[PDB]
Amino acid sequence: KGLQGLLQDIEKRILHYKQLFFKEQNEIANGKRSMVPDNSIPICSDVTKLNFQALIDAQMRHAGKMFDVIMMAPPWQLDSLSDEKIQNMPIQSLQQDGFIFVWAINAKYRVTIKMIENWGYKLVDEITWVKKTVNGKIAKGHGFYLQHAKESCLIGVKGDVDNGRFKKNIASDVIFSERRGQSQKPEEIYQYINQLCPNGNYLEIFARRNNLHDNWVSIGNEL
Amino acid sequence: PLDFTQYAKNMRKDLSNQDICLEDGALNHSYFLTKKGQYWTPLNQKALQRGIELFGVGNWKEINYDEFSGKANIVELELRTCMILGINDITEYYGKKISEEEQEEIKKSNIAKGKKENKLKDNIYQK
Amino acid sequence: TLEDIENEKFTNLEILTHLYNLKAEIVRRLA
Amino acid sequence: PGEDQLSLLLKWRSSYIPPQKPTNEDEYKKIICKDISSEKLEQHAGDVSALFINIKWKLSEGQSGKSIEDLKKLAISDKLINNGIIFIWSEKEILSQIVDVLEAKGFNYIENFMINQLSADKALEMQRKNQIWSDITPEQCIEQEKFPPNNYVQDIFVNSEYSFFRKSKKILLMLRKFNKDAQLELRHQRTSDIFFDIFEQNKPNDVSKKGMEFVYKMIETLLPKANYSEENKGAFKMMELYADDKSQPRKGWISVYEQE
Numbered sequence: 001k002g003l004q005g006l007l008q009d010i011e012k013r014i015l016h017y018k019q020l021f022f023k024e025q026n027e028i029a030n031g032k033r034s035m036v037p038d039n040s041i042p043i044c045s046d047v048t049k050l051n052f053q054a055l056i057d058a059q060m061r062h063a064g065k066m067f068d069v070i071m072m073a074p075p076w077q078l079d080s081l082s083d084e085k086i087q088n089m090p091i092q093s094l095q096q097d098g099f100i101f102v103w104a105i106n107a108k109y110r111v112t113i114k115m116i117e118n119w120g121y122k123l124v125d126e127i128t129w130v131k132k133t134v135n136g137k138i139a140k141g142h143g144f145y146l147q148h149a150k151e152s153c154l155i156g157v158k159g160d161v162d163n164g165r166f167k168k169n170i171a172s173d174v175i176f177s178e179r180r181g182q183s184q185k186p187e188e189i190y191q192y193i194n195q196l197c198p199n200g201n202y203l204e205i206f207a208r209r210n211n212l213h214d215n216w217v218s219i220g221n222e223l
Numbered sequence: 224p225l226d227f228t229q230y231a232k233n234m235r236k237d238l239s240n241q242d243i244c245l246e247d248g249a250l251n252h253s254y255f256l257t258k259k260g261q262y263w264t265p266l267n268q269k270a271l272q273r274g275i276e277l278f279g280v281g282n283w284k285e286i287n288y289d290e291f292s293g294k295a296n297i298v299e300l301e302l303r304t305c306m307i308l309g310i311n312d313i314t315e316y317y318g319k320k321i322s323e324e325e326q327e328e329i330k331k332s333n334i335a336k337g338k339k340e341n342k343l344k345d346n347i348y349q350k
Numbered sequence: 351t352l353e354d355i356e357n358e359k360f361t362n363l364e365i366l367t368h369l370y371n372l373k374a375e376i377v378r379r380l381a
Numbered sequence: 382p383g384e385d386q387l388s389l390l391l392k393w394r395s396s397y398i399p400p401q402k403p404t405n406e407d408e409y410k411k412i413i414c415k416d417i418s419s420e421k422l423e424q425h426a427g428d429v430s431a432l433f434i435n436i437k438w439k440l441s442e443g444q445s446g447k448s449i450e451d452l453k454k455l456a457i458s459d460k461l462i463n464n465g466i467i468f469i470w471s472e473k474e475i476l477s478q479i480v481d482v483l484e485a486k487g488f489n490y491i492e493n494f495m496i497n498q499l500s501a502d503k504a505l506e507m508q509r510k511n512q513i514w515s516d517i518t519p520e521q522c523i524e525q526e527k528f529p530p531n532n533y534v535q536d537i538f539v540n541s542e543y544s545f546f547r548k549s550k551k552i553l554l555m556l557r558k559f560n561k562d563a564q565l566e567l568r569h570q571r572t573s574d575i576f577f578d579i580f581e582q583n584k585p586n587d588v589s590k591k592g593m594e595f596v597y598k599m600i601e602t603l604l605p606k607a608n609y610s611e612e613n614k615g616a617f618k619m620m621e622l623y624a625d626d627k628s629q630p631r632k633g634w635i636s637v638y639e640q641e
């Protein structure tokens with residue numbers, strides 16, 4: 001009856017979708033390229049279990065240099081890892097001259113500033129992302145004191161960044177763009193970083209498959 | 224200056240996992256064309272071929288329990304095995320134990336039939 | 351429940367798995 | 382016809398006309414001094430709840446302003462603020478110093494209120510490049526509300542000169558003192574923490590009159606009990622530290638002037 005017709009329709013549907021599956025797995029084994037750029041270096045490991053000494057040795061062997069920019073979008077405790085465990089990461093051994101970019105929520109602004117100053121950096125700049133709607137309006141949110149429609153990136157610095165490498169008077173502090181996807185930052189931060197340090201060796205911590213970029217070393221357990 | 228292509232290849236060879244590179248530094252784009260946790264590694268394909276060689280065709284539960292691990296989609300095993308023989312109806316081989324050479328000759332016969340009757344799709348005939 | 355299964359957020363393997371589970375459930379309910 | 386991005390982000394300008402200064406001398410408390418850092422404010426105020434420090438930082442060897450030593454020398458008494466919020470202007474290069482010297486006094490960071498700077502010079506130059514609109518100045522554009530159309534405001538930000546990423550925002554730090562005896566009556570989620578306002582490309586640190594009115598109304602509707610009332614006569618709960626004769630003489634506000 002109705003269940004028999006449903007079974008016939010489900011047989012037609014599996015016959016239709018097997019064609020799509022076989023088309024996809026035949027085009028995959030033919031030389032199809034994904035959206036991930038070729039020069040991306042992704043590492044899939046927990047930062048609490050990753051040996052950073054191997055990364056230091058590999059970077060010093062294959063570049064004769066250290067990282068220029070370290071960008072972080074930490075999973076704040078509200079995968080919500082920790083605060084002290086985020087502090088304990090060996091950023092000091094990961095860099096000697098350049099910048100750091102840490103994305104901070106309003107509840108972890110002070111903690112991010114304290115971590116940046118405890119890693120040896122000095123706070124010099126701040127980048128804010130203002131969320132947007134499809135009509136070019138601010139996407140109102142929620143909060144305790146005021147309606148939050150912002151997100152902050154805090155920027156430190158080490159060493160002498162004026163030798164010949166980093167540019168000055170570039171980009172902007174404000175990123176006005178839509179809040180697409182999940183808690184995912186825009187690509188304007190990557191454009192601004194490439195404007196700051198053209199053709200550099202970057203490092204991204206707590207990364208996802210949308211964070212994979214050219215010349216970027218990306219670390220993330222879901223990568 | 225620094226050549227970023229060879230630098231990226233060397234860094235991927237040293238640091239990235241086996242499923243991310245192609246044992247020469249080149250990016251494995253099949254890994255990033257699918258979702259995380261479902262890749263169907265060549266080791267998985269060889270294990271499925273060994274399972275078809277050892278046990279019968281259609282007994283996907285034994286292959287899931289032994290030849291892979293404990294995590295294997297029965298639907299995906301059926302689909303990949305159907306792609307192995309080259310026909311989208313794995314029914315006439317139910318129960319037979321098929322090795323690699325006869326698997327290849329069955330796939331060749333199926334692809335020749337598909338090309339000779341002009342009713343062929345991508346590595347499946349029509350069934 | 352084909353409308354729930356056929357959404358533009360699922361892979362073809364996930365859709366096929368849901369369809370096969372639905373077919374198995376229909377077959378078992380008939381028999 | 383008025384549905385541009387620039388017109389859509391500037392509706393508060395039509396909705397926030399500021400009021401006139403009070404006439405009767407019992408709605409405010411205006412005091413003039415010479416050094417606010419050394420002066421004791423406890424003798425001139427009470428248990429106030431809103432302390433807006435309108436401090437202009439220097440950060441240069443050739444322009445006027447105040448340094449962090451002035452904030453360190455400034456004495457905020459334990460009975461001048463018990464349940465209060467400090468509103469202090471911030472800058473990128475001394476944000477850590479401001480936070481440290483204020484958490485030394487007992488005030489903890491709570492929130493951020495950013496004024497995203499928009500240029501009345503860059504918008505005019507964009508309109509002139511794209512194209513009645515010749516004899517008009519950015520200050521006239523500010524004080525007539527005649528703004529040019531713009532569907533992409535990201536190109537008209539006031540990108541001021543900085544060694545690092547260019548400065549195009551104005552940050553108002555909010556810091557609250559917590560006391561377990563009394564409680565503070567707030568009003569949650571009545572104003573957005575991001576606020577678009579027009580500026581000029583000659584003085585990016587000068588907030589407009591309507592922007593100042595927006596900030597004052599944010600403070601007033603955040604703390605309603607601190608507003609002017611019959612019970613708050615002679616016991617004002619809102620204090621201004623570095624006042625100017627622009628929008629500060631208000632209802633229920635204590636105004637402190639430096640060398641006037």
Ligand SMILES: C[S@@+](CC[C@H](N)C(=O)[O-])C[C@H]1O[C@@H](n2cnc3c(N)ncnc32)[C@H](O)[C@@H]1O
Binds near residue numbers: 073075185219
């Ligand atoms: C706040 S998100 C950061 C990614 C960012 N939202 C984006 O646009 O992809 C946190 C990310 O860190 C990952 N993560 C959590 N714990 C981790 C760990 N111990 N080591 C590495 N990555 C971790 C999460 O799985 C997630 O991918």
